[PDB]
């Protein structure tokens, strides 16, 4: 069949999105969730990870079909996917299948014609709607939406139009908003009575890294998930470079009934982790000016556990076998043990601090350096070399090891 790319393909009904889109990142899957039928933006400066997140989500996720659009970006990255994806297999009926069998790519590299960047975007979402209509869950990646906005600006300039902010055409916000409205979960047209979805993840490339950029500022007025990347995390080789203070998801209430069935321990752990990270951000401004010596022992614990989470939970190397992909069992298990150690360390200090002889974080450090080293080492367990049973048994053994250490206090 043939379809006009500038027209939305019809559906019987649009539905609320109730099921997660799993990225395999610990940040993202725990802290800032997305859904089948969701809309996401990934703004960042150059070299933050917008491409590596887009490729990792394309390799390892619960979607049936992947559409990858690379408009205005490097030719070496389309060549990277064509090299990498045929060698990489998912497993089906006890048999392996290459992930290239479920994937389609649209290319228009940074040196190809500028007006064809618009054609790439509409081609990609029209291909995505066509597979949604078969009753599939599709993810569409747009490797930078800023490169389409920049094409609108040159054509608007040569048509000699009056601009909006930063030279962009006055219609830019309506173009973006009507593109992202093509996402969702649906009852399809026609009579085998099926359902499908499109999730859209759009990278944004704000010039100078400034999120007050008209394209970023229009986009955050539209999308339901915001993964804001930080160049100061990327320069530390802290990856994914997701700023946990500015980033958000609107879908965290939709996923309540999912976690309340499948991972009934999780939402309390997620809540405690956001509070520890927010408490550390309030302490750090005092610490920078006052010089750390004035802190209460519960604040020294809060800083150290926030450091443990920041360094050993929120951090993954995407190019090493144990952290390529993190399952949600490994993710919930790691967070459970870090939050468990926090609650035990806080209890030991808070219980004893009134007595003549009392616990301090420095006492806990000297008593528990092996448990602290074991907690930092939880990340290195490999989801395909080790079993699910072996990983969960090891994380249960760390819980006994730390309980026996706090019993010894």
């Amino acid at each position: 069949q043939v379809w006009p790319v500038r027209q939305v393909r019809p559906v019987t009904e649009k539905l609320p999105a109730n099921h997660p889109l799993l990225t395999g990142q610990r940040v993202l899957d725990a802290l800032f969730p997305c859904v089948q039928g969701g809309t996401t933006a990934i703004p960042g400066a150059f070299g933050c990870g917008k491409t590596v997140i887009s490729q990792s989500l394309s390799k390892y996720s619960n979607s049936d079909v992947i559409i990858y659009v690379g408009c205005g970006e490097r030719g070496n990255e389309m060549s990277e996917v064509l090299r990498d994806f045929p060698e990489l297999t998912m497993e089906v009926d006890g048999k392996v299948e290459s992930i290239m069998k479920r994937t389609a790519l649209v290319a228009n590299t940074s040196n190809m014609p500028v007006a064809a960047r618009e054609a790439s975007i509409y081609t990609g979402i029209t291909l995505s709607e066509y597979f949604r209509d078969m009753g599939y869950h599709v993810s569409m990646m747009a490797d930078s939406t800023s490169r389409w906005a920049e094409a609108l600006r040159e054509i608007s300039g040569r048509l000699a139009e009056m601009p909006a902010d930063s030279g962009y055409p006055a219609y830019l916000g309506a173009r973006l908003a009507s593109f992202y409205e093509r996402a969702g979960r649906v009852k399809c047209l026609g009579n085998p009575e099926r359902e499908g979805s499109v999730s859209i993840v759009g990278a944004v490339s704000p010039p100078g890294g400034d999120f007050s950029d008209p394209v970023t500022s229009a986009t955050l007025g539209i999308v339901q998930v915001f993964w804001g990347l930080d160049k100061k995390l990327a320069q530390r080789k802290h990856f994914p470079s997701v700023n946990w203070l500015i980033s958000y998801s609107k879908y965290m209430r939709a996923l309540d009934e999912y976690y309340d069935k499948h991972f009934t321990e999780f939402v309390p752990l997620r809540t405690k982790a956001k509070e520890i990270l927010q408490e550390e951000e309030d302490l750090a401004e005092i610490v920078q000016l006052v010089g750390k010596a004035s802190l209460a022992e519960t604040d020294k614990i809060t800083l150290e556990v926030a450091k443990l989470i920041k360094d050993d939970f929120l951090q993954q190397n995407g190019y090493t076998p144990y952290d390529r992909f993190c399952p949600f069992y490994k993710t919930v298990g790691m967070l459970s043990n870090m939050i468990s150690f926090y609650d035990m360390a806080r209890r030991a200090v808070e219980t004893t601090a009134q007595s003549d002889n009392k616990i301090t974080w420095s006492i806990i450090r000297e008593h528990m350096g092996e448990i602290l080293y074991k907690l930092s080492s939880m990340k290195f367990k490999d989801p395909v070399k080790d079993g699910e049973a072996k990983i969960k048994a090891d994380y249960a053994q760390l819980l006994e090891d730390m309980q026996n250490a706090f019993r010894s206090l």
Binding site: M162, Y171, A177, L289, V290
Partner: protein, 460 residues
């Protein structure tokens, strides 16, 4: 008194550019006249004349200009300006931004046809609003109290819960007790999830028979947004000033309205205002916001609650800046409170109500209302000034008095501002939660309160 004369039809299109079609050879062209366009495939579109000069007329097309051509597309000139049908049967119906049905019901069988621009009400014939609305929300009913017939927008930003605030006000609003609202709801450029949220809440509250919805979504044409608020307000004026109802009108993103005005003004190549917006945008927004209040000898009213999203959270941007010069205050929704999981995220410092001074007090609410309102505001302002100092010098530098303000500030956000989406506090509960926080200070620090109010209400 009818237009019984035949309509002229022209195939004299001479240019197509953005939202605009240009015609020539038009006979005595009329400013603001409505036009119907038929495309070569038989699709019909509608539009309005923006400019006339000799035989030339410029038309904005409400459903856009795709598939229009300069040879086969034909335009019928209707002889008149835009008059919408109206009736009381419009309550319990759902329409698009053009006022066409989307509920699978029929088209409106008119009780009258009204010009969507309204008619100017004489300043001599207005009644000053003094009946307080109890919204149920303490940050509003305590400190930004609302009179029936006021206009007061919610100023918000991307990712903030302003739709939950507006929906809670629709559930909980009524008069202070020592009548119920008809609701007219306009959506310009909302996502499908927002349209579902409001519609579902009116169905689940069981009140869907007393609401009228006009929906334009983010996939619907941008140029319908020019007329969407005007269809909503022309419906509210019939219900209020002919059928004697009390109407609450919600206009859910005036920022998307202002963006559609910038699309047309840019396409017409006009001299820009600030940030590229039209130089007439104050006058345009005033013809939307001033369509509210009470009139002499008619037992009905219109209250407006517009909603804005501030780009980059900036209140000095033209959209919120011009809106503050027309509306009687604002309710400000704050990312700082939202990031702390306070709900409602209302920041009482930039929030204002310009009509509360006469809607509160003895016989209206209670005699202490103004004094509590001033003293809570003053303490929260001082608490933020103490907190900004403490963040540099550390707690050991603070006095006992500074720690009273810092305790008050934490207690005020936990008890007064935090509330939850279905809790419905009266004014009297709100004012007594206010005194339970003023109890944090000795009477000598409560300097905004007169000694009679201290003596009567402080010792309880």
């Amino acid at each position: 008194n009818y237009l019984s004369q035949p309509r002229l039809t022209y195939k004299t299109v001479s240019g197509v550019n953005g939202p605009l079609v240009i015609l020539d050879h038009v006979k005595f062209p009329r400013y603001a006249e409505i036009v119907h366009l038929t495309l070569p495939d038989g699709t019909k579109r509608s539009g309005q004349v923006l400019e006339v000069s000799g035989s030339k007329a410029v038309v904005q097309v409400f459903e856009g200009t795709s598939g229009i051509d300069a040879k086969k597309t034909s335009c019928e000139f209707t002889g008149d300006i835009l008059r919408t049908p109206v009736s009381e049967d419009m309550l319990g119906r759902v329409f698009n931004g053009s006022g066409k049905p989307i509920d699978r019901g029929p088209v409106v069988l008119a009780e009258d046809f009204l010009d969507i621009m309204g008619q100017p009400i004489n300043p001599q014939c207005r009644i000053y609003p003094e009946e307080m609305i109890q919204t149920g929300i303490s940050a509003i009913d305590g400190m930004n109290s609302i009179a029936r017939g006021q206009k007061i927008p919610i100023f918000s930003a991307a990712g903030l819960p302003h739709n939950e605030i507006a929906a809670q006000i629709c559930r909980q609003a009524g008069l202070v007790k020592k009548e119920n609202f008809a609701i007219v709801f306009a959506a310009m450029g909302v996502n499908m999830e927002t349209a579902r949220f409001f519609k579902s809440d009116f169905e689940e509250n069981g009140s869907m028979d007393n609401v009228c919805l006009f929906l334009n979504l983010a996939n619907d044409p941008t140029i319908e947004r020019i007329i969407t608020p005007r269809l909503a307000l022309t419906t509210a004026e019939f219900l209020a000033y002919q059928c004697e109802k009390h109407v609450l009108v919600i206009l859910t993103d005036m920022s998307s309205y202002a963006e559609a005005l910038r699309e047309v003004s840019a396409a017409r190549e006009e001299v820009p205002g600030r940030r590229g917006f039209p130089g007439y945008m104050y006058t345009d927004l005033a013809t939307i916001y001033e369509r509210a209040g009470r009139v002499e000898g008619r037992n009905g009213s219109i209250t407006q609650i517009p909603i804005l999203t501030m780009p980059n959270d900036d209140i000095t941007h033209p959209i919120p800046d011009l809106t503050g010069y027309i509306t009687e205050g604002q309710i400000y929704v704050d990312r700082q409170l939202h990031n702390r999981q306070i709900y409602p995220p209302i920041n009482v410092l930039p929030s204002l109500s310009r009509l509360m001074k006469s809607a509160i007090g003895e016989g209206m609410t209670r005699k202490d209302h103004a004094d509590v309102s001033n003293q809570l505001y003053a303490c929260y302002a001082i608490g933020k000034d103490v907190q900004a100092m403490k963040a540099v010098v550390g707690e050991e530098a603070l006095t006992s008095d500074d720690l009273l303000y810092l305790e008050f500030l934490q207690k005020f956000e936990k008890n007064f501002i935090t509330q939850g989406p279905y809790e419905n506090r009266t004014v009297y509960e709100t004012l007594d939660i206010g005194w339970q926080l003023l109890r944090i200070f000795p009477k000598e620090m409560l300097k905004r309160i007169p000694q009679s109010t201290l003596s009567e209400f402080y010792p309880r």
